[PDB]
Write a protein that binds this ligand. Structure first.
Ligand SMILES: [Ca+2]
Ligand SMILES: [Cl-]
Ligand SMILES: [Cl-]
Ligand SMILES: [Cl-]
Length: 170
């Protein structure tokens, strides 16, 4: 239902399915479906959720790598950064997003970058995952339009909870 720019394919899943849990485990796999390279420092990804009792939070990138169309392997775990943002206009299943960014790296055509993430409230208290917009339980990465990706701030994949889609589309 949701339009895409066509430069990225975003696949996704949460590896922890429990409704009540004190870590959320978003996993991203972003493929460059264009024929020109992408500078990863211009890519951001957002996972939208409800914090369920505002407390400070921490994000860990447990692992990230860029994998070439032919199989080359570049570890970039230490290049991945997370920032928690309280939304200026919440929706029913989103008052916060985790925004993932990168300090460097290059995504060639056909390459993909995998990001395995984890976040918690600093006191390890519970979240509820059933009121989280971006949550998606699966056994492997699947295409998922409720996480969003941006190149230099321009939305190219997914639908924001507030309704925004790729510019010029409906
Ligand atoms: Ca929640
Ligand atoms: Cl709250
Ligand atoms: Cl979908
Ligand atoms: Cl924004």
């Amino acid at each position: 239902n949701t339009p895409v720019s066509g430069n990225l394919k975003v696949e996704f899943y949460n590896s922890n399915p429990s409704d009540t849990t004190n870590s959320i485990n978003p996993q991203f796999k972003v493929t460059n479906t264009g024929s020109s390279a992408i500078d990863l420092s211009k890519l951001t990804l957002r996972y939208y959720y409800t914090v369920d009792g505002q407390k400070d939070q921490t994000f860990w990138c447990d692992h990230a790598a860029i994998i070439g169309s032919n199989g080359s392997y570049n570890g970039i775990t230490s290049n991945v950064k997370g920032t928690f943002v309280k939304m200026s206009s919440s929706t029913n299943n989103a008052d916060t997003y985790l925004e993932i960014s990168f300090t460097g790296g290059t995504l060639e055509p056909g390459a993909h970058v995998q990001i395995q993430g984890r976040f918690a409230k600093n006191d390890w208290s519970n979240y509820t995952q059933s009121n989280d917009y971006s949550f998606k339980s699966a056994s492997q990465f699947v295409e998922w339009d409720q996480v969003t990706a941006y190149l230099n701030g321009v939305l190219v994949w997914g639908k924001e909870p507030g309704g925004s889609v790729v510019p010029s589309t409906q």
